[PDB]
Design an enzyme around this catalytic site. Structure first.
Site, short mmCIF file in Angstrom:
data_model
loop_
_atom_site.label_atom_id
_atom_site.label_comp_id
_atom_site.label_asym_id
_atom_site.label_seq_id
_atom_site.Cartn_x
_atom_site.Cartn_y
_atom_site.Cartn_z
N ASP C 54 -13.70 -2.54 -8.90
CA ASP C 54 -12.33 -2.94 -8.62
C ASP C 54 -11.38 -1.77 -8.82
O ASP C 54 -11.41 -1.10 -9.86
CB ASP C 54 -11.93 -4.10 -9.52
CG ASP C 54 -10.51 -4.57 -9.27
OD1 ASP C 54 -10.25 -5.14 -8.19
OD2 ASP C 54 -9.65 -4.36 -10.16
N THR C 87 -6.13 -1.79 -3.96
CA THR C 87 -5.39 -0.70 -4.57
C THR C 87 -6.03 0.65 -4.27
O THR C 87 -5.36 1.69 -4.34
CB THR C 87 -5.29 -0.92 -6.08
OG1 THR C 87 -4.77 -2.22 -6.35
CG2 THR C 87 -4.39 0.13 -6.72
N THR C 88 -7.32 0.65 -3.94
CA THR C 88 -7.99 1.89 -3.55
C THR C 88 -7.40 2.46 -2.27
O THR C 88 -7.35 3.69 -2.11
CB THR C 88 -9.49 1.63 -3.37
OG1 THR C 88 -9.97 0.83 -4.46
CG2 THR C 88 -10.26 2.93 -3.31
N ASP C 385 -7.02 -11.75 -6.32
CA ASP C 385 -6.73 -11.22 -4.99
C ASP C 385 -6.77 -12.32 -3.94
O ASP C 385 -6.03 -12.28 -2.95
CB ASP C 385 -7.71 -10.10 -4.64
CG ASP C 385 -9.17 -10.54 -4.70
OD1 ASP C 385 -9.56 -11.11 -5.74
OD2 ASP C 385 -9.90 -10.31 -3.73
#
Lengths: 519, 77, 520
Positions: C54, C87-88, C385
């Site tokens: 994550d 978020t990556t 999410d």
């Protein structure tokens, strides 16, 4: 064996002045790129490990705390500039070091430091007389309303920014927020708050004091928010059920006494709750949190209460509501209770927000920001603060001069042409004083990514032809008349900058030795 | 970018102004070192034959390709 | 003071040093991009160990002392609230834009000019996403396709074996705590809990509150159907302190006297429960054998040893108040609920208090079950999410095809529009195109394919084959055209990705000096 110094460090002469000159440049280098609105930022970290990011020359110099004493003189001169003006610390520090840089080789060639001071005192006075000559007063230019010109000033400062398209909307509210204050204007009186999410048009212009209202405890469906003439309480008391501050731990050996002890601990909250209602406070604004039980109390008594208010918003409400902060609640009376015409809870952006309106001492307001992120609202917080200062200074002083280094090039022209008609050693020094003024527009080009050579050379030609207001345009890489572009600055601010800059260079140039008492 | 440098111009802004002039205009845009700036090359009497630019790319690419195809050098005796 | 041994780094070398710090965080996280992303091993300071891929959890545990890296970590606090999953994508895109900027600094372009081009290219790309987007629930509120989107989201997690059940509960949960027409879903009203044992297929929705606390006695009624719940701080018994009573009994003369006073308080308060009309009496502390013996005769269930924050949530969920003492009880301070049950877990004696509402509620808790705590931990974030996926679709049902299809289409628009900007920002716009390709080029790399061949092959397919964008088949499915694979990302998410990425690049570019005093 019998030594005169015995560990006492001391040096004098040309090596001391040249040493202090290089140290003065180190302070300018730390604030050289921060010049202008689009200037580069500086990151500073303290022992706590938190980072401070800002291009404020005043805040940066306060955080450095340099040990060199020649640098302490420059930093101290910035503090006098803040009290005198409130800005211009980067120009004073950057320009003072430029005088030292240009007279550096002449000092090495044997020219006395005292002869250098006579040039600075002379060229500075000639420059101040030229500022008052070129300075123009603008009150009723072409019978245009002052609100129109003031918006053109704020729009130009906010142009090429995140609110570039909606700059007109932000231009109106900035002028309206300044117009809402009294004659004694002040920047600290106006607040700016941020609200995540939403378009730029949804940014609200609050008339009174407001706060984020992080209060998220129980007590809903009650507490009628509207009040026509409430009495606003300013406290820092915690009314939590099991409060970290207020408790009662009475150990006994009797069951019947525990019923009173559990009630006595409850009575501490109730007596404090009743003292607030005893005086008749309709709005309870506390710094510390408030428990769910205290919410039900005032909800039943037809009164509002919400804690978790920052200290600044309370003191900003202290000047607005017209009361006083009272940490206790026993002596709460009318001497600290406030007043307002409309107190109502608004749900701007879905979150709850409380604000007052029409207070007797309503010398403040608040600007709510709406954007897609927090950094858009943090940059806009200070970007609008620059426009608020521009609108403020135009109202205070109507005599202004062209910014963007326009006056620095005219003074560079006048002093350079005047130095030619000065036989003696003051010729090369007043000319060096003139060339030092060109660092302000040179860094506005460098900090903006433009070619300072091509602009400063083209700009010097336009000033020789007759351009008395042409300067640097941060948006377009070209020369523009900053006077026609409504990019103005007060004439007294530029005078106090040269006076503070020349006084700082003269004080460093007049120094010959550094003495250190070992202790 | 090298011609603009030697002519006393900005290598990046000069090349940039030519690409927009070429997308909108034609080959007439270029650098004129005699006047020191961008101008109509055909009007400034600066022209060369087609074999120079053609033979340059041809011989240069074949040389670059040869250097790319070399994995190792081995001496003999 | 403390200028000596003061760390300093300035000039153009500082900007390249700041970029090198961001690339270290981007290169670390670009491998964990996509469903086939490589996990990360975390060594806790207390000796604990965990594994996860994550992006938000990696940034939270990543202890970075560099100041530029800490700013990139602070972006996660603002990004997870909107997107949650990728978020990556922001960190990878930010590091990609910074790497391409290093080629522009060598050309002699100012950092502010680079930031001005990315902001111009972001509006070009963000404008392109609004065109190629597509809706799902335009003008009607429906539950059929909305559940299918979340089912592909949980498939990226370890809970993929039980991804079909949790999606239905996720839609009913968000629809319960808030209406789709209101378009205001609050995560604070949503809670997630769980316990070891069972499987993830036993995930259930409890409209109300659940707390791991048992009744006052096993002989209490296991069903409180009536909506009358008392929430006191002390139990209905002789009042006791919070720590220890320490009753002083010298001899039998005091025992028979205090026992009468104590027994009187036992009968007085236990009978006060039916005076106010309360059936259930929840108390912070436990009950004595004399009290539970009287509660049984009166049929008055009660809860024991309820925690601090648990007493607060029960008042909010049931609509009651935290009663400080029995003397303050009243009809208004009684909570509301439709059914209170005690649910055990096999052979374990947890027996969590289950307060059901028997109707639509405004707050819902999510109970998770499984054979491992860390898989339950990762299972909790798997719904967070999904709540954002549902919340984002509720705020705007318009969406864009994921799997890299959006990034490749925007790169073509940004490249063409770069020709129309005659200024030094042109090189930055082309750099924005190449930086957009790093997200899809990273997905193919993490799956084990040639990145550039798979990248450019989808480009020409997006230019020659058809106008609708096409993604990368990273899951080794049949082919491209992720619309057939039903891999679709939200429009607000992609806009926040390019926005937060451009902001994070702008903030790092306008910084040109770091200062910190060292130990003297």
């Amino acid at each position: 064996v019998i030594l005169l110094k015995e560990g006492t460090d001391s040096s004098q002469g040309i090596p001391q002045l040249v040493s202090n000159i290089s140290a003065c440049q180190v302070i300018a280098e730390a604030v050289r790129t921060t010049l202008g609105p689009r200037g580069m930022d500086k990151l500073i970290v303290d022992g706590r490990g938190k980072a401070t990011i800002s291009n404020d020359g005043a805040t940066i110099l306060k955080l450095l705390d340099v040990v060199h004493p020649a640098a302490k003189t420059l930093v101290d001169i910035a503090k006098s500039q803040d009290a005198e003006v409130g800005d211009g610390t980067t120009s004073v520090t950057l320009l003072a070091a430029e005088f030292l840089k240009q007279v550096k080789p002449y000092v090495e060639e044997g020219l006395h430091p005292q002869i250098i001071i006579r040039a600075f005192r002379t060229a500075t006075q000639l420059a101040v007389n030229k500022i008052k000559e070129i300075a123009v007063t603008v009150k009723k230019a072409d019978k245009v309303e002052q609100r129109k010109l003031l918006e053109k000033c704020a729009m130009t400062a906010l142009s090429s920014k995140l609110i570039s398209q909606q700059k007109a909307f932000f231009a109106k509210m900035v002028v309206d927020a300044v117009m809402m204050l009294d004659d004694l204007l002040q920047l600290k009186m106006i607040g700016i708050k941020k609200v995540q999410g939403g378009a730029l048009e949804d940014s609200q212009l609050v008339a009174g004091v407001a706060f984020k209202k992080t209060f998220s405890y129980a007590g809903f469906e009650m507490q009628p928010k509207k009040y026509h003439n409430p009495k606003i309480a300013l406290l820092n008391v915690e009314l939590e059920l099991k409060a970290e501050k207020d408790n009662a731990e009475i150990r006994v050996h009797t069951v019947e006494d525990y019923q009173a002890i559990v009630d006595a601990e409850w009575n501490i909250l109730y007596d404090k709750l009743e003292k607030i209602h005893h005086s008749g406070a309709k709005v309870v604004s506390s710094k510390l949190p408030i428990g769910d039980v205290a919410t039900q109390y005032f909800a039943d008594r037809d009164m509002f209460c919400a804690g978790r208010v920052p200290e600044e918003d309370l003191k900003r409400t202290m000047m607005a509501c017209g009361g006083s902060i009272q940490t206790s609640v026993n002596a709460l009376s009318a001497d600290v209770l406030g007043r307002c015409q409309v107190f109502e809870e608004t749900q701007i952006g879905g979150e709850r927000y409380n604000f007052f309106t029409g207070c007797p001492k309503a010398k403040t307001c608040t600007f709510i920001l709406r954007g897609g992120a927090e950094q858009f609202m943090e940059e806009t917080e200070r970007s609008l603060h620059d426009a608020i200062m521009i609108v403020r200074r135009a109202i205070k002083n109507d005599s202004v001069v062209a910014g963007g280094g326009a006056i620095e090039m005219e003074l560079s022209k006048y002093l350079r042409d005047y130095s030619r008609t000065i036989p003696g050693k003051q010729q090369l020094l007043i000319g060096a004083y003139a060339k030092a003024l060109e660092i302000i527009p040179r860094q506005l080009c460098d900090n903006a990514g433009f070619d300072a050579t091509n602009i400063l050379n083209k700009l010097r030609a336009r000033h020789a032809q007759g351009g008395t207001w042409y300067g640097v345009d941060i948006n377009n890489e070209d020369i523009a008349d900053n006077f026609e572009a409504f990019v103005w600055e007060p004439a007294m601010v530029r005078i106090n900058a040269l006076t503070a800059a020349s006084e700082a260079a003269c004080l460093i140039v007049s120094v010959d030795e550094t003495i250190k008492n070992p202790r | 970018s090298t011609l603009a440098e030697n002519a006393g111009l900005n290598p990046i802004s000069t090349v940039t102004e030519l690409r927009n002039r070429h997308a909108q205009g034609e080959k007439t845009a270029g650098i004129n070192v005699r006047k020191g700036g961008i101008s109509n090359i055909l009007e400034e009497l600066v022209v060369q034959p087609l074999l120079v630019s053609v033979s340059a790319l041809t011989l240069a690419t074949e040389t670059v390709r040869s250097i790319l195809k070399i994995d190792d050098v081995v001496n003999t005796r | 003071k403390d200028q000596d041994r003061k760390s300093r780094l300035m000039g153009l070398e500082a900007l390249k040093s700041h970029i090198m710090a961001a690339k270290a965080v981007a290169n670390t996280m670009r491998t964990s991009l996509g469903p086939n992303g490589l996990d990360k091993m975390m060594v806790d300071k207390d000796g604990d160990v965990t594994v996860t891929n994550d992006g938000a959890t990696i940034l939270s545990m990543m202890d970075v002392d560099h100041q530029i890296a800490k700013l990139m970590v602070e972006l996660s606090k603002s990004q997870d609230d909107e997107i949650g999953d990728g978020t990556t994508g922001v960190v990878v895109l930010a590091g990609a834009l910074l790497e391409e900027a290093e080629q522009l600094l060598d050309r002699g372009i100012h950092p502010i000019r680079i930031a001005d081009g990315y902001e111009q290219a972001a509006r070009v790309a963000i404008e392109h996403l609004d065109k190629i987007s597509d809706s799902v629930l335009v003008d009607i509120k429906d539950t059929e396709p909305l559940i299918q989107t979340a089912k592909t989201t949980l498939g990226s997690k370890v809970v993929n074996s039980c991804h079909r059940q949790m999606a239905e509960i996720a839609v009913n949960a968000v629809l319960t705590v808030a209406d789709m027409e209101r378009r205001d879903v609050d995560f604070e009203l949503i809670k997630v809990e769980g316990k070891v044992g069972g499987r993830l297929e036993d995930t259930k929705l409890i409209k109300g509150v659940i707390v791991d606390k048992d009744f006052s006695h096993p002989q209490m009624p296991k069903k409180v159907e009536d909506a009358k719940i008392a929430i006191l701080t002390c139990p209905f018994e002789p009042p006791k302190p919070k720590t220890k009573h320490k009753l002083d009994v010298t001899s039998v003369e005091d025992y028979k006297a205090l026992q009468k006073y104590e027994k009187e308080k036992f009968e007085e308060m236990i009978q006060q429960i039916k005076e106010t009309g309360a059936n259930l009496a929840i108390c912070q502390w436990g009950f004595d054998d004399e009290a539970n013996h009287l509660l049984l005769q009166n049929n008055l269930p009660a809860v024991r040893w309820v925690g601090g924050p648990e007493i607060e949530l029960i008042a909010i969920a049931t609509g009651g108040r935290i009663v400080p003492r029995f003397s303050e009880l009243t009809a208004e301070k009684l909570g509301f609920a439709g059914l209170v049950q005690e649910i055990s877990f096999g052979t374990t004696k947890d027996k969590m208090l289950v307060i059901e509402q028997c109707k639509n509620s405004r707050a819902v808790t999510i109970f998770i079950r499984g054979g491992n705590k860390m898989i339950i931990e990762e299972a909790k974030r798997s719904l967070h999410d999904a709540l954002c996926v549902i919340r984002n679709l509720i705020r705007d049902n318009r969406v864009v095809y994921g799997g890299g299809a959006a990034e490749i289409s925007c790169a073509l628009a940004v490249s063409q529009e770069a020709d129309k900007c005659p200024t030094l920002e042109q090189y930055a716009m082309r750099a924005f195109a190449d930086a957009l390709e790093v997200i899809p080029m990273a997905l193919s790399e993490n799956s084990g394919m040639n990145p550039i061949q798979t990248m450019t092959e989808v480009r020409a397919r997006q230019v020659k084959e058809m106008n609708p964008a096409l993604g990368i088949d990273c899951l080794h499915k049949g082919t491209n055209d992720m619309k057939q694979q039903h891999v679709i990302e939200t429009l607000i998410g992609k806009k926040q990705q390019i926005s937060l990425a451009t902001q994070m690049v702008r903030m790092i570019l306008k910084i040109d000096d770091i200062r910190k005093p060292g130990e003297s």
